[PDB]
């Protein structure tokens, strides 16, 4: 029933880059999903205590959220775009694992994920 530590957003010994793909992931992909009407549930780690979801972190062992992704991108935590893309996919997947088809939160995830997919479809070539 307790919350875990959040995912890491800082690790000074992890090597870092700011690729044109990673910039796109911040300026286009994150910005698009962040501003969306359905962004709010996904803008920070799931608070299992406040939300009374005592089994959340029994089920979800790789938590992820856009608050975490936003800090990662802004703090240049990644080496490549695929790390970040995986973070987004992990976020959507967790929601689908924990919840049921047609739940409100699932329809929100789905709307954000459709947009995610449309933006990632135009990820620029690595320059
Ligand atoms: C429509 C809706 C439904 C549930 C919540 C609670 N909350 C912030 C989240 C957020 C996320 C991302 N997954 C969740 N799985 C169950 N609750 N929950 C917020 C909004």
Swiss-Prot record:
<feature type="domain" description="Bromo 1">
    <location>
        <begin position="17"/>
        <end position="123"/>
    </location>
</feature>
<comment type="similarity">
    <text>Belongs to the BET family.</text>
</comment>
<feature type="site" description="Acetylated histone binding">
    <location>
        <position position="99"/>
    </location>
</feature>
<protein>
    <recommendedName>
        <fullName>Bromodomain-containing protein 4</fullName>
    </recommendedName>
</protein>
<comment type="subunit">
    <text>(Microbial infection) Interacts with bovine papillomavirus type 1 regulatory protein E2. This interactions may serve for the tethering of viral genomes to host mitotic chromosomes allowing successful partitioning of the viral genome during cell division.</text>
</comment>
<comment type="subunit">
    <text>Interacts with p53/TP53; the interaction is direct. Interacts (via CTD region) with CDK9 and CCNT1, acting as an associated component of P-TEFb complex. Interacts with RELA (when acetylated at 'Lys-310'). Interacts (via NET domain) with NSD3, CHD4, BICRA and ATAD5. The interaction with BICRA bridges BRD4 to the GBAF complex. Interacts (via NET domain) with JMJD6 (via JmjC and N-terminal domains); the interaction is stronger in presence of ssRNA and recruits JMJD6 on distal enhancers. Interacts with NSD3. Interacts with NIPBL.</text>
</comment>
<feature type="cross-link" description="Glycyl lysine isopeptide (Lys-Gly) (interchain with G-Cter in SUMO2)">
    <location>
        <position position="58"/>
    </location>
</feature>
<comment type="function">
    <text>Chromatin reader protein that recognizes and binds acetylated histones and plays a key role in transmission of epigenetic memory across cell divisions and transcription regulation. Remains associated with acetylated chromatin throughout the entire cell cycle and provides epigenetic memory for postmitotic G1 gene transcription by preserving acetylated chromatin status and maintaining high-order chromatin structure. During interphase, plays a key role in regulating the transcription of signal-inducible genes by associating with the P-TEFb complex and recruiting it to promoters.</text>
</comment>
